[PDB]
Write a protein that binds this DNA or RNA. Structure first.
Length: 140
DNA sequence: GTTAAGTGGTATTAACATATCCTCAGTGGTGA
DNA sequence: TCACCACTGAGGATATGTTAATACCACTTAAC
């Protein structure tokens, strides 16, 4: 209910403290990583300050930012002194994988290993990309 | 026979590439 | 021979589109 407006007020004050403290959003992610271990990317901080993330995510990142703003005010010099690695797919690999579809929608792990070795991609990367391919094709 | 773990299936989540934009530095047309 | 504001480009820093990656849940399967 009013949690929406309370989050919004917190986010506006958070923007004000970030601008006052002279920290970039990438620097905010770096500080969160070096003070908690869960380093976040600057896109998440952007979507936070603009209030773009979902409600559950909104509540999930509320406490970390609360702690950072309540702690970093003491000393900055010592603080100044674990990403969800997300490998990209280049266009020719994308085209080759699309070619691998339209014939066998759900390949076996035996074929998955061959596909991974053929295009030089990690097995887990190819497996998750295959799952998301199925997912977006089943959307429609 | 019951209960905990593995397997998928689908919803959320969060980072990448590139698209915009802020701000500051470098050059100069015009004026004095 | 001086000012300077206008004018614009560069790099860093934000907003987007988009999709790897994880995470939550129903179903089956293995252990005592």
């Amino acid at each position: 209910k009013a949690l929406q407006k309370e989050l919004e007020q917190f986010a506006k004050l958070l923007k004000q403290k970030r601008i006052t403290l002279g920290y970039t959003q990438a620097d905010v992610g770096l500080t969160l990583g070096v003070l908690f271990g869960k380093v976040f990317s600057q896109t998440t901080i952007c979507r936070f300050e603009a209030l773009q993330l979902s409600f559950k995510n909104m509540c999930k990142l509320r406490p970390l930012l609360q702690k950072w703003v309540e702690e970093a005010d003491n000393n900055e010099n010592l603080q100044e002194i674990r990403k969800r690695k997300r490998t990209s797919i280049e266009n020719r690999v994308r085209g080759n994988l699309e070619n691998l579809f339209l014939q066998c929608p759900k390949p076996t792990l035996q074929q998955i290993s061959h596909i991974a070795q053929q295009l030089g991609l990690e097995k887990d990367v190819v497996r998750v990309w295959f799952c998301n391919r199925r997912q977006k094709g089943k959307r429609s």
